[PDB]
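Reply to thread "Modeling small-molecule complexes from scratch"

Following up on the discussion above, here's a worked example others can learn from. I took a protein sequence and the SMILES for POV and predicted the complex. Inputs first:
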Amino acid sequence: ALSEPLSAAQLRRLEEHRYSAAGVSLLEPPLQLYWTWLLQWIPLWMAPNSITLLGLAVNVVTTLVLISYCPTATEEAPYWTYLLCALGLFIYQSLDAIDGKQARRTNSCSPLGELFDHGCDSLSTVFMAVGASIAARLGTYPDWFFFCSFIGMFVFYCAHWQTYVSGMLRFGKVDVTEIQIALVIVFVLSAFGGATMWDYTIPILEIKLKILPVLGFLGGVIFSCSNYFHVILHGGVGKNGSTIAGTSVLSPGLHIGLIIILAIMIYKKSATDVFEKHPCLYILMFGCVFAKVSQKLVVAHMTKSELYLQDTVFLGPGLLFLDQYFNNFIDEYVVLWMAMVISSFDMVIYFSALCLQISRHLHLNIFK
Amino acid sequence: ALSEPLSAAQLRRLEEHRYSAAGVSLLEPPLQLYWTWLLQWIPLWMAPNSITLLGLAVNVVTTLVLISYCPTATEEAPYWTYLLCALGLFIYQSLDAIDGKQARRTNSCSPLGELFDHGCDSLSTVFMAVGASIAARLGTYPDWFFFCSFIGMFVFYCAHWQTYVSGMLRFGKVDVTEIQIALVIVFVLSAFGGATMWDYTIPILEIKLKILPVLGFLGGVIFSCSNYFHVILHGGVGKNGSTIAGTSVLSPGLHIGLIIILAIMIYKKSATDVFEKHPCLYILMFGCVFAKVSQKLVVAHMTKSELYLQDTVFLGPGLLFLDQYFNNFIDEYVVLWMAMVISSFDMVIYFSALCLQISRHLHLNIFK
Ligand SMILES: CCCCCCCC/C=C\CCCCCCCC(=O)O[C@@H](COC(=O)CCCCCCCCCCCCCCC)COP(=O)([O-])OCC[N+](C)(C)C
Ligand SMILES: CCCCCCCC/C=C\CCCCCCCC(=O)O[C@@H](COC(=O)CCCCCCCCCCCCCCC)COP(=O)([O-])OCC[N+](C)(C)C
């Protein structure tokens, strides 16, 4: 059951699926020419998934180095790692636009071209949220460093939730490019100037200035989530009011609801403060868990199937829950690292098995 | 979804099902004549389910009165309620044998004749375990008063688990009649003599004498559970090694495993001692939960279907878990009573809806 996570009929609907998108906003038309200009120099024999993997690897490595120099969020790393992580984010966005575009150039358009960008994009969402939240030094306001970061997951889920009830990705007037440019702006601003300026309050209203960008982000989240939820509650494609697989429209929200609710409990209950001594492992552990859950919803909307709550990676956070349901029976930092290891292996094994099965069933190499 | 817990195809397999049993042991042949002798005086127009309900009502009322005079298990009720509860147990056993036998007399043999005795028998198992454990005053050894009582559930489940992989009830050389006569013996012994004799240790080995009957019961549990598990792990009927519905043989054990594991956690974690101030509400709450779970397995083995972990009555104990996962946020006795109310209503609603649907689909009255 490990090496065959899909059935033959699921492979048939995946072969039947066709990709579609209906998203135009403000910041793309200045960037389309730039993306094409970086595109033509790339040789045509390079596989698209190689581009995706290169971007994800660069972003993960740079954000891991930045996490290494700042495991918490109350101290400043040297500016060179801020600039390097910003360049990693920019090259990641460039390679994602390139992979979406240059892959179409060969009849490579295939469904492993997605069920990938939507896995690599999930991982990059988690890592980018952690990196942006560190660079702004949100450890002085730990609640935000939690809440904002998990909003950075939830919006993503809503976007794919939208697709699950429409079969086509609707972007909206403010979307991924705006966040990505805003985050490279905050990265280069915390790089060129000292990060201590984020502690400089405004004399107008005595606000710490770490609150203004996060409330701008929160307001944009309100716009995008209203735009998503309108068609979540008013888009019925597969039936009179249901989703593209016939499942009730409110079913996929249970997954991200359970993840966020578990995060709330393990935040609030912890007698030993796991955050104020070691964050960014907690958010990475829910990052791997949310990565598998979002990958499952990706598979669900491009292959018409019902969502399933039963997953093995909920053994990751759930372990913490058990070790918090008792007294600390094992030291919480050690069980958190164990949850890291078990969730990371289960996510990686699931994702590699999925790509291997998709490649073997279609008799196509992962790299062409 | 409340008023139709079954599908049309499930009703079809229930109509297809036929009852079978292969159990003969020591204590039945002296009792068969007695049961028939009490049987012939009963008029033929009385419905079998009326007999089942009368027995269950008498047992529940008597055990509830005995619980009322001893909410804990460290004090003695007057002897008249001991004798009354013993007579209730005996008349319950008599009416169960009568309902199994005299119902066959009309083409009443129907499948609502079971999917009842196996619901009323589950309720009676829980109530009888609580009554026997009170009458022996197991509050001085609370662990036993827990553990033994939950063994009194688990064996029952194993029996039906046996049926789930063989389609026919195998009793064994020691079975329900032995327990029932032993419990009416312990009831009349604690009635005629003072219950304080259960505190009289034996000078031979300094044993409290509440340990000897519970270890005899435990040994008999070992015999019966080995007899069940041999065909659990070596009976394959519907497939090469699977169950009568094709489901893996170890799947139904997860339900009773989860119930017992939740009971273990809420026992051990409780900072405020729920037991030493108010037991017999805790065991009754897991009694209603285990009653619904065992009723579901009854439906599963006489109507070929897969077991489902998702049930609403796990909101009952689970609530305690949540109120224990935090600090006591609400006083534990009050949330335990709330769990009582919610689990009792969900179990009663499920069971009455099930019987109503079975009656309406077959166009047969519940009483004939
Ligand atoms: C920050 C300033 C605020 C002002 C503006 C507010 C804006 C927010 C408003 C509204 C939000 C709208 C978001 C919708 C996202 C869609 C999800 C999705 O699947 O798309 C993509 C995933 O997307 C990603 O790769 C990144 C996900 C971003 C969320 C994490 C940010 C949280 C960090 C917060 C930390 C802050 C720390 C404190 C602050 C210093 C999928 O990729 P694709 O579709 O295949 O790409 C091809 C399409 N293309 C060709 C167009 C490229
Ligand atoms: C106690 C002395 C120990 C010595 C002997 C050890 C013996 C134990 C050994 C082995 C155990 C074997 C048990 C198997 C039961 C089968 C389950 C089942 O579905 O059958 C029946 C349910 O059964 C019931 O109604 C009652 C269930 C009894 C369990 C609760 C007792 C715990 C109390 C412990 C508290 C102790 C306190 C401390 C002690 C003072 C279903 O009913 P039926 O099949 O439809 O009926 C018709 C068939 N008939 C015609 C045959 C009637």
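What I'd highlight from this example: Chain A touches chain B at residues 265, 269, 321, 324-326 (CB under 8 Å). Chain A has 13 helices and no strands. Questions welcome below.
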